[PDB]
Amino acid sequence: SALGKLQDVVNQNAQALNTLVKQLSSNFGAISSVLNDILSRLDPPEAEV
Amino acid sequence: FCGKGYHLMSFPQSAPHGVVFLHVTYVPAQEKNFTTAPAICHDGKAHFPREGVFVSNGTHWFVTQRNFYEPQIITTDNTFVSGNCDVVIGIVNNTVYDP
Amino acid sequence: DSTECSNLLLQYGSFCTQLNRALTGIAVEQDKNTQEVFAQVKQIYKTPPIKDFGGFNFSQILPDPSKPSKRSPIEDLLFNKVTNGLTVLPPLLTDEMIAQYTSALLAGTITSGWTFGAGPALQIPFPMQMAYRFNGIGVTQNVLYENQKLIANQFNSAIGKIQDSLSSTP
Amino acid sequence: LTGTGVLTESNKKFLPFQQFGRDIADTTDAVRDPQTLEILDITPCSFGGV
Amino acid sequence: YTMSLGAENSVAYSNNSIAIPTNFTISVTTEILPVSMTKTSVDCTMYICG
Ligand SMILES: *[C@@H]1O[C@H](CO)[C@@H](O[C@@H]2O[C@H](CO)[C@@H](O)[C@H](O)[C@H]2NC(C)=O)[C@H](O)[C@H]1NC(C)=O
Ligand SMILES: *[C@@H]1O[C@H](CO)[C@@H](O[C@@H]2O[C@H](CO)[C@@H](O)[C@H](O)[C@H]2NC(C)=O)[C@H](O)[C@H]1NC(C)=O
Ligand SMILES: *[C@@H]1O[C@H](CO)[C@@H](O[C@@H]2O[C@H](CO)[C@@H](O)[C@H](O)[C@H]2NC(C)=O)[C@H](O)[C@H]1NC(C)=O
Ligand SMILES: *[C@@H]1O[C@H](CO)[C@@H](O[C@@H]2O[C@H](CO)[C@@H](O)[C@H](O)[C@H]2NC(C)=O)[C@H](O)[C@H]1NC(C)=O
Ligand SMILES: *[C@@H]1O[C@H](CO)[C@@H](O[C@@H]2O[C@H](CO)[C@@H](O)[C@H](O)[C@H]2NC(C)=O)[C@H](O)[C@H]1NC(C)=O
Ligand SMILES: *[C@@H]1O[C@H](CO)[C@@H](O)[C@H](O)[C@H]1NC(C)=O
Ligand SMILES: *[C@@H]1O[C@H](CO)[C@@H](O)[C@H](O)[C@H]1NC(C)=O
C-alpha cells in the first residue's frame, strides 16, 4: 500500500468508466435497453418515445 | 513542506501518473541536558551569544551552536556586549576570554 | 418503503450507488481533513505543573482543569459561539480529542519551540525561545532580554484583547 | 438480432441452450449461427477521432 | 476501543535548562503526489445512440 495514492486515482477513473458502460444496460423505463431492438420491433411513432 | 525534519535536499522520481519525492532531511538525535543562561556577566557588562547559546556541563560554561553540541570557550569573538548586568533576568557570572 | 417505486427505480440503474459512493467519499474526506490538520504529532505533550515562563501567561490558551471538557477558555468561548433517509455520521475525532491534539501542540510549542516539529522535543526556556524567534525576524537577542517584562505584558494584554474581541463580536 | 461489427471465428464454447453472448454493456459480442452451429465473436467496427 | 491519540511525553521544562543534540540522523522519506489522470474521451453521439 505504498503507492496507494496513484492507485486510488486509477481505480476511481476505471470505476467511473465502468459505471458509465453499465449505464448502457438500463432501459430507463423503456421496453428495452437496446436501440436496435426498438428499431426492429416498433414503428417510429412509438419508437420516438 | 519537504519532509519531516530540517530539509536538506530532495530527489524526484517518476511514477505512473505521478511523482515521488525522496525528501532528505536532517533529524536531531541523542540530545543531552545542559544548564543554560540568557547572558554572561563579565566586568559589569552583559554578553550575549552572536549565533549560538550558552550551555553549562555543571561546572564550566561554554557557547555552542543551537542544533549540534560543539562547546567552545566563551570569548569576545563569538559574543557581543549590550548593557550591564542589572537588566537581564537570569544573567550568571562567568569569565569572558580575550584573544 | 414502496416496493413498486424501488422496482421502477431499478430501471435507472446504479444512480443510487453513485450518489452513496460520492457521499461516502465526502464523509471519509472530512475525517481525512481533520487528521491532516490536527494529528501532526505522535507524542501527546503536556505542560509542567508550574507555569513559570518568565512572565508569559498562557492560561487563556492552555486547557482549564476545572472544565470537564478540558478546553481552553478561548476554545470554550469558540464552542459557545458556534451554534426521510437522511443520516448524520459522527466525526471520527470527537471535540475533546481534537482539543487534546491542540493542547499537545501548545505544550510542544511552549516547552520546546519548533524542535518538536522537526524531531525529538528539546526543552528550552521560553524567554530564550522568544529570543530565538526575535533573531529569526532579524532583531538581536539583547532587545528581547532587556525588554522582557514589557514583551510579556504586551503578549498577555494582546491575548486578553483576543478573548474580549471574540466575546464582544457576534 | 441486428447490429454492425466485425465477425471473427470464436474460441468460446456455448452451451446448447445458449444462442448469443452479452458483454458488460449488454451488447451481443458472441453469437451462434442458426444454420451451421458455430460461434462468432463480434468485435465492433473501428472508431476514431478525426 | 477508544483510539489512542499517542504516547504521553512530558517535556522536562525548567527555566534554566536546555536540550542540545549531540548527534544526527540523515532521514530520507517518500512523498507520493498524483500528477495526471488517464485522458479519456467519450463520443456523446456514439455513447447515447451508437
Ligand atoms: C565540563 O567541561 C570541562 C571542559 O571540557 C571539564 O574540564 C576538564 O575536565 C577534565 C576531566 O577531569 C580535566 O582533565 C581537565 O583539566 C578539565 N579542564 C579544565 C580547563 O578545567 C569539566 O570537568 C567538565 N565538567 C563536568 C561536570 O563534566
Ligand atoms: C555576580 O557578580 C556581581 C559583581 O561582582 C555580584 O554583585 C555583588 O554582590 C555582592 C554581594 O552580593 C555585593 O556586595 C556587591 O555590591 C555586588 N556588586 C555589584 C556590582 O552588584 C553578584 O553577587 C554576583 N552573583 C553571583 C551569583 O555570583
Ligand atoms: C495569568 O492570567 C490569568 C487570567 O488572565 C490570571 O488569573 C487571574 O488572577 C486574578 C488574581 O489571581 C483573579 O482576580 C482573576 O479572576 C483571574 N482571572 C481568571 C480568568 O481566572 C493569572 O493570575 C495570571 N498569572 C498566572 C501566574 O497564572
Ligand atoms: C533531563 O533531565 C530531566 C529531569 O532531570 C529528565 O527527565 C526525567 O526522565 C526520567 C527518565 O526518562 C523520568 O523517569 C523522570 O520522570 C523525568 N523527570 C522529569 C522532571 O521530566 C530527562 O530525561 C533528562 N534528559 C536527558 C536527555 O537526559
Ligand atoms: C552518532 O550516531 C552514529 C549512528 O548514526 C554513530 O555511529 C555508530 O557508532 C557505533 C559505535 O561507534 C558503531 O558501532 C556503528 O557502526 C556506527 N554507525 C554508523 C552508521 O556509522 C556515532 O558513533 C554517533 N556519534 C556520537 C558522538 O554519538
Ligand atoms: C528559575 O526558577 C527558580 C525557582 O525554581 C528561581 O530560583 C530562579 O530565580 C528562576 N530563574 C529565572 C531566570 O527566572
Ligand atoms: C439446417 O438447420 C439446422 C438447425 O436448425 C442444422 O442442424 C442443419 O445443418 C441445417 N442444414 C443446412 C443444409 O443448412
Side-chain angles (χ1 to χ4, degrees), chain A residues 18 21-22 24-25 34 36-37 40, chain D residues 1-4 22-26:
Chain A
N18 190 359
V21 190
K22 290 289 181 67
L24 288 176
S25 71
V34 183
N36 264 325
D37 275 13
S40 61
Chain D
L1 182 62
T2 50
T4 310
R22 289 194 174 108
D23 66 336
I24 302 299
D26 281 342

Side-chain angles (χ1 to χ4, degrees), chain E residues 7-49:
Chain E
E8 194 165 328
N9 198 343
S10 178
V11 176
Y13 178 83
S14 72
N15 62 351
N16 66 329
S17 176
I18 202 167
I20 307 293
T22 67
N23 210 334
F24 43 76
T25 301
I26 301 305
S27 169
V28 179
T29 59
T30 53
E31 176 162 26
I32 297 100
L33 285 174
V35 173
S36 55
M37 325 194 296
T38 298
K39 296 160 63 183
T40 73
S41 188
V42 176
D43 194 358
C44 174
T45 301
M46 193 172 171
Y47 170 76
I48 297 172
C49 293

Side-chain angles (χ1 to χ4, degrees), chain B residues 4-5 28 33 53 66 80 82, chain C residues 117-118 120 123 132 135 141-142 146:
Chain B
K4 179 54 73 179
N33 283 340
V53 64
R66 300 166 181 169
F80 69 91
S82 177
Chain C
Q123 75 264 9
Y132 282 18
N135 289 15
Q141 283 189 346
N142 68 270
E146 289 155 356

Side-chain angles (χ1 to χ4, degrees), chain C residues 51 57 59-60:
Chain C
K51 305 289 186 291
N57 196 312
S59 61
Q60 303 321 106

Side-chain angles (χ1 to χ4, degrees), chain B residues 11-71:
Chain B
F11 299 120
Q13 296 287 270
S14 61
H17 298 301
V19 63
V20 176
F21 294 107
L22 306 194
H23 297 302
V24 189
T25 59
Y26 173 103
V27 178
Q30 295 182 250
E31 68 271 3
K32 168 163 194 55
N33 283 340
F34 298 97
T35 302
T36 190
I40 293 300
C41 183
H42 181 62
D43 292 331
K45 289 178 299 281
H47 304 257
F48 305 92
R50 269 189 212 185
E51 69 275 16
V53 64
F54 298 135
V55 290
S56 168
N57 63 343
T59 56
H60 285 146
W61 282 95
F62 307 98
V63 64
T64 181
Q65 59 187 281
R66 300 166 181 169
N67 297 306
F68 186 79
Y69 185 50
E70 184 183 272

